[PDB]
């Protein structure tokens, strides 16, 4: 019967909550209260990337920490050389409604997708010398919100159909399907070892998935609204989420609960993007109030503010070597800060 | 590495020339978001004007129009609707023939969205003939509604049909006038699915939207 | 539906059988990782312009 | 334009004053 | 008119040369009077002449009869009475001359102050509009040119004032310096360029409103051309005409129809601007009426009046008030209105479209907050 | 986590009255605008009533206007729908829906199927 199924589910949730409460011996705040604060963080803009016609949704740094890719609603993927500000490639998209872009770790491929429900993989190392559609992955019944390369032949995508997918680029087939979310899966983050990944959806919950078996390992709750961003800690044992409730939260894989909440009284706008520094001490979050906030990830203190953008900050990413952080906003400009 | 940097400069110059051409093409094209229910008559309007998202291209008086359809998307329109915050207009099609209350709630959500502000809405009150050939129980206030003095009924129209259609139009316009503030405007039209004037109505509304935006830039309005 | 309810119950049973460590130990581990990589974080400590590519 | 008209009027007035002062000094 | 002194000196030299005769000349001797001349005549010979043309310049009434008799000099016989000796000085009122000095000076200082304030405000306005890349748009570019045209007009007026009146109190009429003519040419060009950029503002706004989707970026160069080159062409034509026909003095006098080479097009521009202004108003009237009887804002015209008032300085519609007035018909009122009040126009513009603009104020306060 | 629990409802004679309650947990109740929706047998979800954050702005659908009243207690983090003089077509499963985001006038997808911020619903039958 449905009623006994519901009561079994609620008693299981009560047992899980009791176990989490039992494991909550101490708070991270009262543990890091005795460490020195990071002080005022004064980042400045060094480069301003211009050329995009419309608002920008996604950017992704290359593993060389020099080249990056940006996706705009005019139908353009642009590869920027952040050192010299020059444009390397300009890829026109068949569908101008792009919401995500990814850079392959090898740098030979780029990915995009959006309202067309298609994950387009472009080859940047063609013999002829021009960028062409290497592959088109289809099968999602909802808009593509995020995509991340595992390697040159495997990709992971999050869609608005409440499911995630693991695709083999060579065969173009959806090798694995991750189901369980009850809302639009908005953000995706791969672990440093690329063995697990966290997905944040519009059901105010985050889920940890194993790549091999395609099953949900843990579910983390605590956010009051839709989760728009997610990012692993550099260690890989924890992650951070930003939600529409104007809060960021730090969840732990081993503790299976939330450790810290980053929010302020005067912040009433949702978070669109989050990222960690190289050491994980700083948490950078982009907000709807046109600004980015750098928080002390260990003390939940507002370390600094990045206030160079004129419109909504849609994305931000930190280089692999941690030299600089690039923010892309709806004002059609990218800004590199350090 | 002067030669390596020279290659980057020339490649950037080529890319910027292509981007200038693309910008010239892009600024001369008007993008419209077509919203409506499955039974509201949106599909037949699309057919007359001619999987994730559908495209229609049409030229009116040598002016290009780039119209989009929702396509294969879930009813959860909370997130992807933001992607159309910068379109020229949202053509919202409502079947006037309680789906009317659902359409009103959707229109209210679109109008009051923080990102859909500054975006104008062209209201197509479709299926006017079905309403004419077909309210008190679903809308009690209709008992105390009178036809506005500014109404311009088509000749040979039953006064009851005119009263009903203008009541629906005023019900939709109440939301628009509640929080208009002049940042965006609503354009209602009494249309039919097979009407050939819908294209002209959209073109005229786009002209008015562009003129009002230009006036706002000069603070004249 | 009923099948969704069984799936949710099974997922909850699978998730309730995991092993959880104390929050204090995990916080200590996170703090230790942060302290062991502080010198390698260019954002925490401003880097001189000599080896800063964006300058 | 009014600027040129004023310039012409000012020049003519100054020319008359210069001749008048000259005549007064001589006479 | 310094040729009067030249021909007076010529007459003096001629009479001195003629005085070489050895005749006794009893009664009427031979000597050149300080203002007139008289040939040697026998005793008892007296004649009747007219007052000299030079004194006719300042005299209200001319043609008076003056006696010429046998005396050494004057003594009410070579010129009977001090009144003929002072044909122009006595006729003229020191009052009218004093009142004229007050007018030409009050007007001078008034438009000097207006142009200086306008230039000072427009310099910082252009700097603000050009330094901030966020404000870079076609509208602002057309406005930067309007502010540069105003600045050039003010600078040209100042240069003309220094070259014409500040230096060369009397020698300017005697000799026409090349720099004087160059300053006059620059002044005319700057004035015409300012008028044509006021017309361009009217054309740009009318094309944005009336034309459905013009994509004005592709004809920005046409706007620049009509703003700058056409005034240059007319100025060159006027300079050629002055050189070939009326190369007199500093070219600062209006005698022939060559003035209509400059006054001609500018007037037309003003007229055209007025028409465009009216058209724009009509279009604006079509955007405040669509609200129904329920929505009135207590008047559909209060918003119209404010927009019309703030559009008046951007095009120079006030110039239509005295545009059709002839140069000789009530010059004082036209000069006062178009110089004492008109010279502030750019200053007003430098506020109404730079300092009171919403986008400019928002960017300025954002930059101040970032700096602070 | 977000948890909305609805209590009340059942069998009642036509023209009767009853008070549905809903208790909310896992979020700040005072920051969210709340909705009452219903699903009739063989029909889709239909919006019924709407209350703002402070309760100043209140709206109803035309079918139940004048018979249903909606209220909220922010201190108790709960809301109530009192229904008077019921009719046979009011038999449905009533759900309480929370607006997806706080401090927003718009409220998207409350009546859409599979909505995360919606309760399990309580049955009301005449």
Numbering used by the authors:
A (entry chain B): 3 to 340
B (entry chain A): 12 to 61, 205 to 251, 264 to 300, 308 to 394
C (entry chain G): 8 to 62
D (entry chain P): 1 to 27
E (entry chain R): 36 to 407
F (entry chain N): 1 to 126
Which of the paper's sentences describe this entry?
The pituitary adenylate cyclase-activating polypeptide (PACAP) receptor subfamily consists of three class B1 G protein-coupled receptors (GPCRs) that have diverse physiological functions, including modulation of inflammatory and neuroprotective signalling pathways. In contrast, the VIP/PACAP receptors 1 (VPAC1R) and 2 (VPAC2R) have high affinity for both PACAP and VIP and are activated with high potency by both peptides.
The datasets containing complexes with PACAP27 (VPAC1R-Gs and PAC1R-Gs), were each refined to global resolutions of 2.3 Å or 2.4 Å (tight and wide mask, respectively), and the receptor alone refinement reached 2.5 Å. VIP and PACAP27 bound to VPAC1R are angled towards TM1/TM2 as they exit the receptor core, whereas PACAP27 bound to PAC1R exits the core in a vertically aligned orientation (~6 Å/~8 degrees relative to PACAP27-VPAC1R). While the S2 side chain in both peptides engages with the conserved E7.42VPAC1R/PAC1R in both receptors, the additional space in the binding pocket in the vicinity of S2 observed in the VPAC1R structures led to a distinct water network around the N-terminal peptide residues relative to PAC1R structures. The high-resolution PACAP27-bound structures enabled modelling of water networks around the N-terminal peptide residues that highlighted the differential distribution of water molecules below S2PACAP27 for VPAC1R and PAC1R structures. By comparison, PACAP27, bound to either PAC1R or VPAC1R, had reduced ranges of motion during the MDSs, including a more closed and stable ECL3 conformation that was similar for both receptors. Further comparison of the persistence of contacts predicted for VIP-VPAC1R, and PACAP27-VPAC1R, indicated that the largest differences in interaction patterns occurred in the most flexible regions of the complex, in particular, the ECD, ECLs and top of the TM1/stalk. Modelling of the disulfide bond in the VPAC1R decreased the ECD mobility, and stabilized ECL3 and the top of TM1, particularly when bound to VIP.
